Amino acid sequence: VFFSHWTSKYKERNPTEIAYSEDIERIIDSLVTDEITKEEIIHFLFGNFCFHIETMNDQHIADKFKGYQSSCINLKIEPKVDLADLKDHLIQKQQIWESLYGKHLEKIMLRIREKKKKEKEIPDITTAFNQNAAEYEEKYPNCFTNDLSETKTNFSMTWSPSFEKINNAIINKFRESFKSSSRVIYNSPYSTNKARDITNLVRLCLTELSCLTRNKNEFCMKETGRENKTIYFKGLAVMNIHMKKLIRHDNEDSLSWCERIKDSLFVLHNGDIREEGKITSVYNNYAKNPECLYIQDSVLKTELETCKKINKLCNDLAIYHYSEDMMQFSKGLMVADRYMTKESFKILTTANTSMMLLAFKSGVPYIALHIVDEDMSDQFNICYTKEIYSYFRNGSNYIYIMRPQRLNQVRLLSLFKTPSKVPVCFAQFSKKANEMEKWLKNKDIEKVNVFSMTMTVKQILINIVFSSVMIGTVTKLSRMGIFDFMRYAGFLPLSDYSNIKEYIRDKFDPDITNVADIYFVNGIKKLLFRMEDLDIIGGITDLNIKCPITGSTLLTLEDLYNNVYLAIYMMPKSLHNHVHNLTSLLNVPAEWELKFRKELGFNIFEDIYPKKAMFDDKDLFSINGALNVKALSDYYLGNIENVGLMRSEIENKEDFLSPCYKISTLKSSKKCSQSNIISTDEIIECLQNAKIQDIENWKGNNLAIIKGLIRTYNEEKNRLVEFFEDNCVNSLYLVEKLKEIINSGSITVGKSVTSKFIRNNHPLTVETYLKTKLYYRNNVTVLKSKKVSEELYDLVKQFHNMMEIDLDSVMNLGKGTEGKKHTFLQMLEFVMSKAKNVTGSVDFLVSVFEKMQRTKTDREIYLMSMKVKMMLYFIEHTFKHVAQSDPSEAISISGDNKIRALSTLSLDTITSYNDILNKNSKKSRLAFLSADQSKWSASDLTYKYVLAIILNPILTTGEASLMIECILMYVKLKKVCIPTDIFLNLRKAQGTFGQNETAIGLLTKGLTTNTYPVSMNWLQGNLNYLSSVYHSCAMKAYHKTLECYKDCDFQTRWIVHSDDNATSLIASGEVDKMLTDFSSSSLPEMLFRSIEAHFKSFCITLNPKKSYASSSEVEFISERIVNGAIIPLYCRHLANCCTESSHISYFDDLMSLSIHVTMLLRKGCPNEVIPFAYGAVQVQALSIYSMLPGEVNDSIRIFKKLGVSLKSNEIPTNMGGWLTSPIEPLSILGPSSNDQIIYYNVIRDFLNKKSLEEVKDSVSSSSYLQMRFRELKGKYEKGTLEEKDKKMIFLINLFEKASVSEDSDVLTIGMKFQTMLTQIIKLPNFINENALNKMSSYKDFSKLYPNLKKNIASSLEMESVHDIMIKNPETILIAPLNDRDFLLSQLFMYTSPSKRNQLSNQSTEKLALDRVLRSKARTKMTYEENMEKKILEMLKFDLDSYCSFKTCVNLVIKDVNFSMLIPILDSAYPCESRKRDNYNFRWFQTEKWIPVVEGSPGLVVMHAVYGSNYIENLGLKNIPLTDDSINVLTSTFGTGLIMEDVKSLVKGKDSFETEAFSNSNECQRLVKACNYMIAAQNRLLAINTCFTRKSFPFYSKFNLGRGFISNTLALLSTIYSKEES
RNA sequence: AGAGCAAUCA
Helix, strand or coil, rough: CCCCCCCCCCCCCCCCCCCCCCHHHHHHHHCCCCCCHHHHHHHHHHHHHHHHHCCCCCHHHHHHHHHHHHHHHHHCCCCCCCCCHHHHHHCCCCHHHCCCCHHHHHHHHHHHHHHHHHCCCCCCCCHHHHHHHHHHHHHCCEEECCCHHCCCCCCCCCCCCCCCCCCCCCCHHHHHHHHCCCCEEECHHHHHHHHHHHHHHHHHHHHCCCCCECCCCCECCCCHHHHHHHHHHHHHHHHHCCCCEEECCCCCCHHHHHHHHHEEEHHHHCCCCCCCCCCCHHHHHHHHCCHCCCCCCCCCCHHHHHHHHHHHHHHHCCCHHHHHHHHHHHHHHCCCCCCCCCCCCEEECCCCCCEEEEEECCCCEEEECCCCCCCHHHHHHHCCCEEEEEEEEEECEEEEEEEECCCCHHHHHHHCHHHHHHHHHHHHHHHHCCHHHHHHHHHHCCCCCCCCCCHHHHHHHHHHHEEEEEEEECCCHHHHHHHHHHHCEEEEECCCCCCCHHHHHHHCCCCCCCCCCHHHHHHHHHHHHHHCCCCCCCCCCCCCCCCEECCCCCHHHHHHHHHHHHHHHHCCCCCCCCCHHHHHHHHHHHHHHHHHHHHCCCCCCCCCCCCCCCCCCEEEEECCCCCHHHHHHHHHHHCCCCCCHHHHHHHCCCCCCCCHHHCCCCCCCCCCCEEECHHHHHHHHHHHHHHHHHCCCCCCCHHHHHHHHHHHHHCCCCHHHHHHHHHHHCHHHHHHHHHHCCCCCCCCCCCCCCCCCHHCCCHHHHHHHHHHHCCCCCCCCCCEEHHHHHHHHHHHHHCCCCCCCCCCHHHCCCCCCCCCCCCHHHHHHHHEEEEECCCCCCCCEEEEEEEECHHHHHEEEEEECHHHHHHHHHHHHHHHHHHHHCCCCCCCCCHHHHHHHHHHHHHHHHEEEEEEECCCCEEEEEEEEEECEEECCCCCCCCCCCHHHHCCCCCCCCHHHHHHHHHHHHCCCEEEEHHHHHHHHHHHHHHHCCCCCHHHHHCCCCCCCCEEEEHHHHCCCCCCHHHHHHHHHHHHHHHHCCCCCCCCCCEEEEEECCCCEEEEEEEEHHHEEEEEEEECCCHHHHHHHHHHHHHHHHHECCCCCCCCEEECCCCCCCCCCCEEEEECHHHHHHHHHHCCCCCCCCHHHHHHHHHHHHHHHHCCCCCCCHHHHHHHHHHHHHHHHCCCCCCCCHHHHHHHHHHHCCCCCCCCCCCCCCCCCCCCHHHHHHCHHHHHHHHHHHHHHHHHCCCCCHHHHHHHHHCHHHHHHHHHHHHHHHCCCCHHHHHHHHHHHHHHHHHHHCCCCCCCCCCCCCCCCCCCCCCCCCCCHHHHCCCHHHHHHHHHHHEEEECCCCHHHHHHHHHHHHHHHHHHCCCCCCCCCCCCHHHHHCCCCCCCCCCCCCCCCHHHHHHHHHCCCCCCCCHHHHHHHHHHHHHHCCCCHHHHHHHHHHHCCCHHHHHHHHHHHHCCCCCCCCCCCCCCHHHHHHHHHCCCCCCCCCCCCCCCEEEECCCCCCCCCCHHHHHHHHHHHHHHHHHHCCCCCCCCCCCCCHHHHHHHHHHHCCCHHHHHHHHHHHCCCCCCCHHHHHHHHCCHHHCCCHHCCCCCCCCCCCCCCCEEEECCC
């Protein structure tokens, strides 16, 4: 049935004695027990498919039986002759294999009893802290000091005192103040030549050098005296342009000092006099009158007043002005990295009236100067006692000079995100503080003041201000460490967890280097002391204390979880040093491989002899062996039901029989890191053709090779001599030529210059130096990051025997659909036959790159080659559907909603069954376990998967052999290549200081090899489905083992993600005797110890610290759920709103952040934080791209200057507008709703109607838009235009010019936003030529069409190129149908300007600085002038825009979601009758969705957390617009190649005449009007489509659809929140 | 002086 096709060519290959390795024989020989022998285990293993015989085809049964007979013949036994004999043997087997679970149960009970007695008990938390400090002191001697005057800087690198007096005025004020007598006073750091030098330097630079000037602020130094030069040079000598000093955790002096620091900072913040600014304007717009974001304003009146009071406190506590000063100073410091030299300096002044920075030429050093009044002098001295060098007095003021500093670009960006970070932290902490929010509710907005506060509330406010500043201005790494400890130290209020003292004893890092984080450490210590003192409301009886903001009288656990996780998630990412981070990341697999190698008996040099028979129920690296195959057989038998249907579904849905470019994963542009090196033949032939007469004529590769071998002769003479001996016959000739070269004197030599030799030279030089350096009878290679699409193009070229690109070979074959194609497994078998040949095993080589994981500890990403990527795709996608049939598995998720769906399904099913089973039973106990495995990749085995390939009943004999061969080569041939820069750094350090090395220097033979072996550690992310299938198999085996206990009945449930586990267990019966036998005091303790023992038997290492068992709380990955009620956890979206952006435009960034705003609205956030989230995303977008109000490059200012009739809130977001949509259309529809509402409002205003029903009823009748356009034309002709008509003209022309926009040569088969408009304005990216030159498709393009196309004859070549494009339009119009449409499309992608900038490699952090430099520049006109001429061209009428107006009206009206949301939003009853009976943020739930998911019916909920569908798919019209605009563009290029003044053609061919008729009018609009009435819908056989009609079908029906209706669905409420009433 | 703790950037 269903025509089972042989999907391989390896039909005659068996898993044993036919594949490349004989490891299967000793895998078998290591599996024999005392009761089950060799013929028994091979009978079961190679013939257990007979249970899956009712649902397989006859060819499948015959092939598997022939494979069984061949394998049993190969393994030297007598096979069974018939199926009935095999079934009789198999039922005898199933008896002797079912007699194992009792032995396994006794083994885990003995293991639990053995592990119980070995532990040591920590007496208390203080002793745990002392033991951690003692072991850290043993690791680092003399680290702890008692002198506080030698620690690090306290208040980061920033100092912002408030100023009381209302660019050159501040500078000459500092000039006037800095000319008094020398009354310089120095201070001790905690109660002096550098201070004298810096004081003389600042007084010289402020007296004699500031008045040669440039750019009104930057001055140099040449024409001054010798004494002034000496003072300046001493100042820069001071500037410079283990040694750990730590303080203990039990210091009370640091606590008192930090309390005084907090009080002095709060006194300092209450002195500012400014009341206008840039951040203040946007935040006061969004939060001063927050009723403009809601629809039903009158039904809630406490929430909006609380938001207003928080905004008033932010205004009165200088939060906005402090953030503005930080952002301005960071922008100035980023800008100051310019073409200046070391003898010139810059003066930086922000809008603050008395703060000055002296910036000099790693970073930019600077000096800060402040002028404080007499009343705040002592508080300034206390608050900044660490960082004051000197101060003096002038009149009634004090002048302060601060220390020299230095900052990196990432820290400058982190300080640049201060207005996004700080105010939302202030808002959330002030909301979560109970006494603060009740005082704000008690007092009125006219009477809230700082000086009217109770002392407790004032202390809470001081803690909130200090915590908000220290969170939003994070620069160091000790804060990152203590917040990671605060992340993992929240497991106190649960049951048995085994990390109340062990986690603090092991994983705590006492890296306290200043006195500000002593506050956080004391807060977490107070919380743990209170917890150890001894749905769910917490803190009303625990009486605990918030870690950041003290905040007594806690309401719920949700507030503390959100506060702590917001503090975790609002840290930067890329703050680690590159060399140290990469050495640690390369050191972890080296030691984790040396541990396995030294444990299991292998020495360093030998290979990976697979099974030593020590992989049998041991501790470190072992499985049971004879239990794993029974568990896998039982899992397959209970899981796989229909083998033929499952195989057919795999072949259809995953596309095994499709060509490789039809696979989405193997086609997209990622990095694959192939190997590339210059061969030795090139080097020796370059040395042969090197001419002593042409020493001065050496340019390029010859010079690079010559410098490399000159450095090799200077450093490793014997190595180079033996290299010449083993690679050239005329070694003496090469040696004497070397002597003649080095005796010429026309070259340059180099000493030890660290990584600068790599940095400022050619890569060819350093790679030939490494190759000539590390010659040890081997081949050393480096890795270069290539592209996946480019490697697929090269592989498709190589499969068709096209070694070199030929003009006629590609074009001669591939006619139509019925031309030559290929399949994925044909390519895979060709690639495997290539890679099995002897080539040095270069295909299995991995490069390691650094991921950014927001923590001080860092993860890594691995780059595997194309061949290994294809075998991993094969394995991981033939195991994808096996996980899709498992209901207890959660890697086959439909996004993020399904995770919560099956988590709540597990919890509510086990709670319901416990409530059912509790009635009239003997005893009942329930437990849950949130588990996290220790090391999922390094500590696990890989030969456990070979045992799982064989038992698969889906596969047949021949594909399982190929998978076994792939895995056996993957284990044995894998190695990791060290990057060249850190390799040379390690070699230099070992040469000059160490002469000995660590585990990496033991795996490498004394740092003489670039690559080191890693074998049993399959790297992270490579096997994500197989490991989860094995995890579920292990859990099912655990349940079947628990079934064997006689006294009690156990029911287990589990949810499996890779490296995750959420187990739940109900036990009934003799629970006391059961717990006595299991040596546990409670069921969570039993579950913890039994799961640990069983997983250790299944080679899965459980982490005893970061895993906890409880009785009512489950945590799968996040968003913990208690008693069937979920905890929201919106703080991830809250922190993502303020930190992460794409930095590609303003429009795209605004929609990307609005996605997070919508998701935060769906996750159930309080009403107060919503305007601050609006302001935060607006501050980020406007501060990076379209400048925030108060400066040049605005948009409202440009509109006001040009006098456009649109209002301030009517600007669309593509023109630089603001996110001004209401909240319910945002939460339901999405970020495109503001553009839709703007267009709908101007459409209703122009058509003079009242309701959407009337508008659509008038539009649906014909002869209406024509008469409206005729009336508008007559009004423009007479000149009696109105405001509504001008707005409609502007928006019609905006929609018409959005089709043109700029850089619109993109194919864009799938868009990101599905928005109605386009981007319109794009700053040109940083485009190079070297990265374009490295591409092999670019080399093929430059070889096939010559160097005239590299960057008369060029015109005719481009004419021929577009002629062959016009002759085959399917190449540029469709994604590649077959061969002769993919590779030549890749060559065709390089034609014309503005098509080669689609290949971009700029990171998201190196693009923001480029955009900051680019926006204040000419890229040539300007940004503001480009915008001004765009509105000047847009304000005119322009003719034949009726079709654009009609399509705009149709696209607005036709949306079913909009047309069903708008009347029910306009006519929704406000409250009651089971709508709005609660008011504590229980209106954000009901009025958001309950009329809507009752309008779109199928629900009964009142309080829910939503995971929505992709119902707003507004992308079925923009893709036709893009496709026929692309066809119009290439037709325009062809006809402009033909002739000029193309308005009417000269009667060429039929395609030219039809394209002339197309572009006489608007082609996209008239083909839309044609497809509106025609219903052809041809079958796309690529034969009759050209026969029927060329142009209109070829750019109408070839987008696989026309303009049709959308679909609505009921928003998919995952599960309820806890219902309140 | 500042950043970091593989003996690193200035």
